[PDB]
């Protein structure tokens, strides 16, 4: 399924997201200065399962969940230099049941261990001056499909 | 190459469309009531090297080419009834050196001689009440990429 | 990188199969009259690193390791029943560091965790009667490859 | 759909090979020392549709047809050299309706016009000293599939 996620906006998806379930989501362009940079999955609820806060500026990526009326959680992070490749960077999601993978251009994954227990409903996308196009493609996946050779 | 092409705008190409790269189109949506939609693949000149009129109320595609302060040429066209597929109707246009091959959701092939022998530097998308999401998805290849098996 | 995998028989890897490593088995047949079929994924010392005994007979497939001339460990299991797609049934191993992913063609994956810390030089197929064909072809990546639209 | 094709043998198609489908032949290994490898399209009277004889030794690759018990015909010539990729070379044909379109890992396509009006049933792969592995694997496609962004 093809989604156009557009910046501080969100696209509900058609199927909940969840385990086996694969989001492609990829930029038409790449703003070397832009700022901070927000990708949310959110449940029905509109809690937040999985929180990316891409930060040049602070040169990180930090990963988070919270519920609604929550606060933040403890914050997993990794360094922001060499993950996007421009023109047409990219960031892949993956739900394994008891963790998210996450995959940018560059790099080895990212793993994340699932914090509230909810599939996703709908996907959000924030920033003020983004890193990223407006919008962004999105492909959700059910499943991993069939892949090419190479 | 990705890009977001919007409605009655156009996208200008990273490098010419020429033998062998292959357009691959896709919209988020369908517009059942929607009216008369066009794409061009046109050449830095702005002759219209291919144009592609799709129209639901007429219930046909129209294929033609046209220089850019130049006439229409003799039309080619096909059944509109059975082509795309909802909700991510697609749009796959191959150059084949003599000709282009255009690929919908359904149905066979539709090859159409090349009439300006020139290259494409932009693809532009019009629409007063588009069949389409805005933007669609293009993504553009400068040759056939290695196939899934399925 | 391809492989042909013949039965009864192995193919040594041109890169260690580790961390973001993906493995594509296809078979060109369903024997659905075959035996018990196994695929293990052997260290360059030759210790079993992930042992996957498919076994028809007794409805079920089995996960385990062990050491070259050492003794297996506890049992992973799962249902052999509506896993497998004819005529053209894959298995997909993927090397998440920690631990692999198997996914067959219905169902959900299995997740198994690493019990031997090496990576994988060769890749072992044996059986009397096999369920697949001989050989079987193994597409190996360095990394996840860039997804199609489905 | 997979099939195994192993050298001096063939495959029958499940389906006939007709407008729109498309066989991409892959090669485990390159022998560049080999000699000369060929590839015929045969239809079920075995009349030869498609012949490509990969020549190494004379620098060329031709394609020609011939019936069953007839001659062949004029022949259609390319350059030989860098047309394949080692270690695991490859060989797309896709039909055309009116014209095979056959591509090689480097270089333009090369279009051949069709001879003889019937569609293929088997694919025959022949050689002395292969220039490919034995079998090489060929999945057959019904019309071409959703394509991965690279
Ligand atoms: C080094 C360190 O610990 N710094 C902390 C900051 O990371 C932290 O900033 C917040 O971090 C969370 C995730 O951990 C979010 O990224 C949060 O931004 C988001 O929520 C905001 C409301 O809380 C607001 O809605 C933003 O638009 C949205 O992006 C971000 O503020 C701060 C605050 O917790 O503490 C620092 O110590
Ligand atoms: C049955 C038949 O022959 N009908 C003819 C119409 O198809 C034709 O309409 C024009 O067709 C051309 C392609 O053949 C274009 O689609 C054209 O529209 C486009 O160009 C316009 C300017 O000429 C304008 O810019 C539109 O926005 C753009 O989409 C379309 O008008 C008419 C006119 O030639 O004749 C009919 O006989
Ligand atoms: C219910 C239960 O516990 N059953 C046990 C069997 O599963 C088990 O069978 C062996 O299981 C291992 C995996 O745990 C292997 O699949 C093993 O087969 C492989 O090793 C054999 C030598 O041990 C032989 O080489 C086979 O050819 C090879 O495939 C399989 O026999 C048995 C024995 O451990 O115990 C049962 O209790
Ligand atoms: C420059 C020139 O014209 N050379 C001609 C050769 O190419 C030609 O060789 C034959 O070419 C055909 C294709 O046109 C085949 O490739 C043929 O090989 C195949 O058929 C053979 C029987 O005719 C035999 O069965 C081979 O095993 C099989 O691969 C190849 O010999 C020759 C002969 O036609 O004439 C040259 O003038």
Redesign the interface.
Request: charged share 10%.
């Given at each position: 399924?093809?989604?156009?996620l557009f910046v501080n906006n969100q696209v509900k998806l058609?199927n909940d997201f969840k385990?086996?379930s694969?989001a492609?989501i990829?930029?038409?362009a790449f703003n070397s200065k832009g700022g901070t940079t927000v990708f949310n999955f959110l449940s029905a609820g509109e809690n937040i399962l999985l929180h990316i806060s891409i930060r040049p500026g602070e040169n990180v990526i930090v990963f988070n969940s919270r519920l609604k009326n929550g606060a933040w959680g403890p914050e997993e992070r990794i360094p922001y230099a060499e993950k996007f490749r421009p023109?047409?960077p990219s960031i892949?999601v993956i739900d394994?049941?008891d963790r998210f993978?996450i995959?940018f251009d560059y790099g080895?994954?990212i793993?994340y261990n699932k914090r509230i227990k909810e599939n996703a409903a709908a996907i959000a996308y924030n920033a003020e001056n983004s890193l990223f196009?407006s919008?962004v493609?999105v492909?959700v996946?059910g499943?991993?499909?069939?892949?090419?050779?190479?």
């Open positions: 399924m093809l989604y156009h058609q385990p086996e694969v492609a990829r930029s038409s023109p047409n892949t394994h049941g993978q995959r080895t994954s793993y196009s919008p493609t492909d996946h499943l991993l499909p069939p892949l090419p050779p190479a």
